[PDB]
């Protein structure tokens, strides 16, 4: 028989489409166990923020008889698809998209019936709150502003705000509207000179929960309007930002900058990635020079998600346990759930693999626990100008490593 | 067999089901009658909501009236946008917690088919005036485990402009666990300091959650006579208000939504059954008025002879065209206006029902009405 899996990607789906097919391709060439096993898939592309379209495509995928659904979307569609896959007992590996570059907050999912929760989030829980807490405490900040953009979901700040309150910190949450030019013009039109000069001092300590580009514009507008100063310390907080983007921030900043972002283990599974004195062809083992750099974090987790499924298919068949999929169209009210779903889900949860993001596994709460961040601080030399330097790392196992 | 509308209600759907049928019934007393199909779905089940909505659309409907939480509202908004089915959405009270407007998806320009029957949440405006009038500089805002703090955005921004220091603290569902956790993690001095910060607080809680919260605070000696707590929620009953003041040690304020009071005509709106309106929740009122709004829209549509028959719409095909009569029907509803249980209902260009009114109650020395706030004239009284 055949292993058939469904995939749903929001526009722009080009990188996901490519990476997912690379993953499946890598398996059929190298997987010595799924050797002689066929692997097929159907990829659906949907508009962003279109949960109904997501339901249409997922339901079409259910008629094709799929063993699992891999998705990469925003939260609006994730919520709908989680609800759908719960009802149909279809294992659902959900790779949360970067929301327009903004800092990520975990999606608000629906309650599941006991022992029938089929959505597995591939990306780890957002642990930026923990790193921000350590950082403001080490810096001995008592008062500070947290700027967040028009897409950031501040519910993600819950644990930070509760802990900040217990510590007696005074935190000011300020939304930055999409038009940065109007944001700052508004300051000068609504505030007297003294109020404005006071406001400038309050801005000496800030956290930027912004996208890389939004942060760049925000910094430039602050400097141009003379609301920035050398006597400031701004902390950019986002799982995702590139090195060129970091340079744009420090090149624009007058004062000190700190950056918190996710990093990944160096994948040199030597010997693991070697066969007969020959290196294995695969994105994980032999990557093209500069390619993984062009990928977004969610692409990495998409690749590893496919590895996770393959691992489950290994274990499912070695035990000689197998359930064939049935043809079900779910919009139709009379549709029955997949009887083999519970077993397939369980097999996936007990899985463990090492991929582009490092170790992937699922705890009892259905979370992929490991995450690691680096903490960068600004530096300067007449020769090279403004550059960032690594000061420390933070991971979900051992916590902080290094000083601040 | 010409006017057909679809309805979807989350469990518990009993009062909505009941009130929806009363609205249609009251109308039928005053040729072409309104017919309907009601679907009941599980709470927090957007997929089920889509299934029932799609089934209703194959039967052909002129409009969809729903009363659900935000998860299902989001899915149904996306559906009705695609099919061009007018969608009157009555947001449910989230377990009694203070309401935050649902986060809806972007719609194509001029093709946004969801109309929220309940007005925008204006509690932020009232809270702003109140803390400024009370000359509060530092205070805590307690919110429960169901409250969506994205709803506080405009309050937080304005508070920052005014230089207020606001502490946001989540109160989990297990009230017994809340305070016990404090006594185990804080030194005597730290806890005594915490106690002082609690002299000024806003309660974004359910009526019952607030009652339990106040009692737990008093029992653990974190409450005091020299405190002032403000309960903020569109919905709380008179008996529930009394439970708060009976439990409170210090001063209490309550902010809540209020509504105008309406041969006598037989109908829920004019001749109310004794004790009947007392059992209704606010969303039930807006659900009733929503049906009035639709009937008024169907009236104007037919007199102008610009009628469009209902179509059979299939959600599976993708090749299915949206309802040709959808845009004109939507436009007709938006230009509509009626007076119902909630007072005037209408829709601006931003598709919002703008009017809302609150009363402010304070603190013998028992609770009494101090002032009102409305979205047209603002504060009245002091
Ligand atoms: C913001 O406003 C300015 C001035 O009105 C305009 O030039 C600009 O296009 C607007 N949008 C953005 C994204 O800056
Ligand atoms: C901590 O960081 C150092 C680099 O300074 C590294 O060599 C070491 O392996 C790390 N160990 C732990 C336990 O974090
Ligand atoms: C609430 O907290 C108490 C604290 O011990 C615990 O015993 C109880 O089980 C909790 N209730 C629920 C419903 O979890
Ligand atoms: Cl600002
Ligand atoms: Cl922005
Ligand atoms: Cl400061
Ligand atoms: Cl990357
Ligand atoms: Cl830790
Ligand atoms: Cl449910
Ligand atoms: Cl949602
Ligand atoms: Cl707001
Ligand atoms: Cl608390």
UniProtKB/Swiss-Prot annotation, chain A:
Keywords: Calcium, Cell membrane, Disulfide bond, Glycoprotein, Ion channel, Ion transport, Ligand-gated ion channel, Membrane, Metal-binding, Postsynaptic cell membrane, Receptor, Signal, Synapse, Transmembrane, Transmembrane helix, Transport. One of its GO terms (cellular component) is glutamatergic synapse. It is found in: Postsynaptic cell membrane. One of its GO terms (molecular function) is identical protein binding. Its main location: membrane. Equally in forebrain and cerebellum. Disulfide bonds join 59-330, 75-107, 273-285. Residues 1-404 are extracellular. Glycans are attached at residues 110, 179, 401. GO terms for biological process: negative regulation of synaptic plasticity; phospholipase C-activating G protein-coupled receptor signaling pathway; regulation of postsynapse organization; regulation of postsynaptic membrane neurotransmitter receptor levels; social behavior; synaptic signaling via neuropeptide. Homodimer. Interacts (via extracellular N-terminal domain) with CBLN1 (via C1q domain), and more weakly with CBLN2; the interactions mediate the trans-synaptic adhesion complexes also with neurexins and are required for ligand-gated cation channel activity. Member of the ionotropic glutamate receptor family, which plays a crucial role in synaptic organization and signal transduction in the central nervous system. Although it shares structural features with ionotropic glutamate receptors, does not bind glutamate as a primary ligand. Instead, forms trans-synaptic adhesion complexes with presynaptic neurexins and cerebellins, regulating NMDA and AMPA receptor activity and influencing synaptic plasticity through signal transduction. In the presence of NRX1B-CBLN1, forms cation-selective channels that are proposed to be gated by glycine and D-serine. Belongs to the glutamate-gated ion channel (TC 1.A.10.1) family. GRID1 subfamily. This is Glutamate receptor ionotropic, delta-1. It comes from Mus musculus (Mouse). The chain holds residues 22 to 425 of 1009 of the full protein.
């Amino acid at each position: 028989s055949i292993i058939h899996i469904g995939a749903i990607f929001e526009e722009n789906a080009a990188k996901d489409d490519r990476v997912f097919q690379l993953a499946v391709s890598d398996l059929s060439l190298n997987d010595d166990i799924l050797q002689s096993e066929k692997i097929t898939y159907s990829i659906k592309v949907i508009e962003a923020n279109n949960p109904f379209q997501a339901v249409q495509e997922a339901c079409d995928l259910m008629t094709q008889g799929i063993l699992a659904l891999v998705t990469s979307t925003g939260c609006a569609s994730a919520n709908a698809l989680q609800s759908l896959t719960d009802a149909m007992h279809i294992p659902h590996l959900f790779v949360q998209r970067n929301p327009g570059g903004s800092p990520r907050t975990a999606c608000h999912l629906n309650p599941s019936p006991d022992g029938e929760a089929y959505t597995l989030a591939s990306r780890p829980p957002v642990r930026l709150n923990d790193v921000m807490l350590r950082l403001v405490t080490e810096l001995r900040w008592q008062k500070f502003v947290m700027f967040y953009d028009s897409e950031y979901d501040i519910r993600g700040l819950q644990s930070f705000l509760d802990q900040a309150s217990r510590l007696g910190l005074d935190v000011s949450l300020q939304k930055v509207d999409k038009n940065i030019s109007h944001v700052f013009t508004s300051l000068f039109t609504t505030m007297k000179t003294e109020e404005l000069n006071r406001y400038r001092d309050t801005l000496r300590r800030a956290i930027l929960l912004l996208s890389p580009q939004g942060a760049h514009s925000f910094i430039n507008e602050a400097v141009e309007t003379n609301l920035a100063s050398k006597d400031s310390h701004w902390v950019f907080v986002n799982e995702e930002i590139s090195d060129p983007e970091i340079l744009d921030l420090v090149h624009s900043a007058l004062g000190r900058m700190t950056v918190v972002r996710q990093i990944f283990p160096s994948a040199k599974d030597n010997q693991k990635c070697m066969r007969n004195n020959h290196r294995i062809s695969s994105l994980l083992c032999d990557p093209q020079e500069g390619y993984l750099q062009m990928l977004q974090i969610s692409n990495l987790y998409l690749y590893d998600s496919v590895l996770m499924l393959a691992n489950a298919f290994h274990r499912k068949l070695e035990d000689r346990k197998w359930h064939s999929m049935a043809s079900l169209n779910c919009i139709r009210k009379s549709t029955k759930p997949w009887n083999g779903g519970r077993s397939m889900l369980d097999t996936i949860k007990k899985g463990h693999i090492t991929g582009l993001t490092g170790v992937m596994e699922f705890r009892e709460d259905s979370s992929n626990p490991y995450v690691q961040f680096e903490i960068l601080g600004t530096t300067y030399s007449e020769t090279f100008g403004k550059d960032m330097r690594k000061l420390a790392t933070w991971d979900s196992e051992k916590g902080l490593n290094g000083s601040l």
